[PDB]
Structure 1
Amino acid sequence: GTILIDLSPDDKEFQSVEEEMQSTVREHRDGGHAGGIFNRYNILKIQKVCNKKLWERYTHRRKEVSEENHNHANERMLFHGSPFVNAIIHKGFDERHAYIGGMFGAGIYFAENSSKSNQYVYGIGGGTGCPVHKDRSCYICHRQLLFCRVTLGKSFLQFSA
């Protein structure tokens, strides 16, 4: 049920998504070990993910949360990087996409910093890097990230290093 629609670089929507991607790069405490050494990206393509069933699944849950939280879904736009990007865009997020060993328990993790999500594109800790060169800092191979609509509702605040 999923179709992918290419955005033109001239589209204000392409431009605002690219700006969120580029502007939320930071340096990481691993010196680039997991995600590579970089300060910015070369954006090759931005596609809108269209799936009516998955969208209706999201908005149904969003209304449930909102009704439990004084009509406030606390919806954010956040990054997600995963080796399972292809399954996610076709079948939706579920338990198979969870970070079982994550520091806040087994759930599905999202980042404000696109560069944090970039650390997970090739797996936890960057895995063994790109499939072709086995390089976590590969400047050749094409990577994919998701920019996702996320319902937080009432969120438990964890202070952490």
Structure 2
Amino acid sequence: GTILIDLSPDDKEFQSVEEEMQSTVREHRDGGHAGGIFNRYNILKIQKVCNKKLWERYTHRRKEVSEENHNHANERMLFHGSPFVNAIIHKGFDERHAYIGGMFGAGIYFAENSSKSNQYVYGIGGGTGCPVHKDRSCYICHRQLLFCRVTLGKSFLQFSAMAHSPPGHHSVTGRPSVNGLALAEYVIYRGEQAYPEYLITYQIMRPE
């Protein structure tokens, strides 16, 4: 049921999404081990992901959450990188897309920082890198990220140095307490609380 619609680079929708992508690159404590060494991306394509059934599933859940949290779904747009991006855009998020050993338990992880999601495009810790060159810092192979609509509801705040939501909460907010320049990461425990709205195809760029 999924169809992908190409946005034109001249479209302001493309531009606002590219700007979120580029502006949220940061340095990582691994020096680029997992995701590569870059300060910016070459964006190749931005597609809108259209799936009626996955959208209605998302909105039905969003309304329930909102009703449990003073009419506030606490909806964000957040990045997600995963080797399962093609399954996600066709079938939706589910338990198979959870990070079982994640620091906030077994849920689905999202990032404010695009470069943080980029670390997971080829697997946990970057896996073995790009399929073609086995290079976690490949400047040639095309990567994909999702920019997702995510319902957080009442989010448990965990300051930081498929399972269930903590009782009374709809998600977890991992807030970096040590690196004051890292943005938050978020965990949801039901796939119905995220819709994979934009599929972004890109390359990381070698610093000049």
CA separation in 2, counterparts of 1:56 and 1:115?
A: 30
Count of paired positions: 159
SS in 2 for 1:129: coil
Offset at residue 13 of structure 1 (A): 0.1
Offset at residue 151 of structure 1 (A): 0.1
Per-residue CA distance 1:11-37 (angstroms, 9 max, x = gap): 000000000000000000000000000
Per-residue CA distance 1:112-133 (angstroms, 9 max, x = gap): 0000000000000000000000
CA separation in 2, counterparts of 1:101 and 1:111?
A: 17
SS in 1 for 2:120: coil
| Runs of at least 5 residues in structure 2 that lack an aligned partner in the other structure | 160-208
The percentage of aligned residue pairs carrying the same residue is 100
Offset at residue 47 of structure 1 (A): 0.1
Offset at residue 79 of structure 1 (A): 0.1
| Runs of at least 5 residues in structure 1 that lack an aligned partner in the other structure | none
What is the root-mean-square deviation in Å for CA atoms of aligned residues? 0.2
CA separation in 1, counterparts of 2:121 and 2:98?
A: 14
CA separation in 1, counterparts of 2:134 and 2:60?
A: 41
| Greater per-residue helix proportion | 1
CA separation in 2, counterparts of 1:8 and 1:39?
A: 24
> Which residue in 1 is equivalent to 2:114?
114
Offset at residue 109 of structure 1 (A): 0.1
What's the TM-score once normalised by structure 1's chain length?
A: 0.99
Per-residue CA distance 1:92-138 (angstroms, 9 max, x = gap): 00000000000000000000000000000000000000000000000
SS in 1 for 2:139: coil
SS in 1 for 2:133: coil
- Structure 1 segments (4+ residues) deviating >6 Å: none
Offset at residue 141 of structure 1 (A): 0.1
> Which residue in 1 is equivalent to 2:81?
81
